[PDB]
Amino acid sequence: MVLSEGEWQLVLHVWAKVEADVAGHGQDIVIRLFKSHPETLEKFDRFKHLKTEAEMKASEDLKKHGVTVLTALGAILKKKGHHEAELKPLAQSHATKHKIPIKYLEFISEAIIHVLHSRHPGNFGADAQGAMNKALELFRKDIAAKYKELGYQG
Numbered sequence: 001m002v003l004s005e006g007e008w009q010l011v012l013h014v015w016a017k018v019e020a021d022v023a024g025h026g027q028d029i030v031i032r033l034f035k036s037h038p039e040t041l042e043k044f045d046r047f048k049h050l051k052t053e054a055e056m057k058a059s060e061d062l063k064k065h066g067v068t069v070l071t072a073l074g075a076i077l078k079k080k081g082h083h084e085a086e087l088k089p090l091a092q093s094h095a096t097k098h099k100i101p102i103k104y105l106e107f108i109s110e111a112i113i114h115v116l117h118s119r120h121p122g123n124f125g126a127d128a129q130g131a132m133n134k135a136l137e138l139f140r141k142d143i144a145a146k147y148k149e150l151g152y153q154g
């Protein structure tokens with residue numbers, strides 16, 4: 001797939017808002033993922049002991065990991081599709097070391113869209129959401145193709 005420049009502008013316009021508070025957005029997204037799809041929490045040996053949302057909010061570690069996740073995603077979205085290099089190490093660690101199924105990347109995509117819709121209603125109308133969804137679908141498709149080449153079924 002290929003996004004048009006207008007779709008990338010809608011994605012990077014909302015992302016510039018997210019970047020005003022990377023840690024707050026990373027925390028909301030990862031918690032949203034774990035609350036919605038609790039099975040994803042089992043993949044993190046680091047955080048699986050966390051039992052409640054209050055414990056998740058109070059974990060500095062979790063907040064630090066959310067920042068790492070959004071910084072890496074931000075770096076990929078700012079390439080506007082030319083992200084082949086950035087994707088290689090990410091696909092290798094998530095397919096070989098962590099073993100993350102593509103279905104879980106769909107679940108976090110849903111969590112990113114939920115949180116942006118909830119924090120940025122004015123910059124995340126239907127067209128901007130469609131463009132973000134297209135950008136994350138592109139990301140998932142390119143990662144799934146890499147998973148294949150690496151020998152891991154998504």
Ligand code: HEM
Pocket residue numbers: 040041043044045046068069070072073089090093094098100104105108
């Ligand atoms: C937007 C999609 C995601 C991005 C950009 C992302 C990014 C990262 C980055 C940059 C790291 C540290 C370096 C590395 O190990 O590769 C990492 C580690 C990790 N990721 Fe992801 N990730 C994503 C989705 C997921 C999902 C959906 C899961 C699980 C359901 C997951 C599980 C993990 C685990 C288990 C680690 C190691 C955590 C720790 O022990 O430090 N990732 N991720």
